[PDB]
């Protein structure tokens, strides 16, 4: 079904930036150890 796929992809891109976030917040905390 095309709708489960666009809500793939835009649960994805959610998803990348939550992740690029939290690899973000990591190097803060290895900056404060």
């Known amino acids: 079904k095309v709708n489960r ?5 835009k ?3 959610a998803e990348r ?3 690029e976030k ?3 917040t990591f190097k803060n ?3 404060t150890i």
Request: glycine share 0%; hydrophobic share 35%.
């Open 11 to 13: 649960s994805l891109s």
């Open 17 to 19: 930036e939550r992740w």
């Open 29 to 31: 905390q290895m900056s």
């Open 22 to 24: 939290t690899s973000e």
């Open 5 to 9: 796929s666009t809500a793939l992809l």
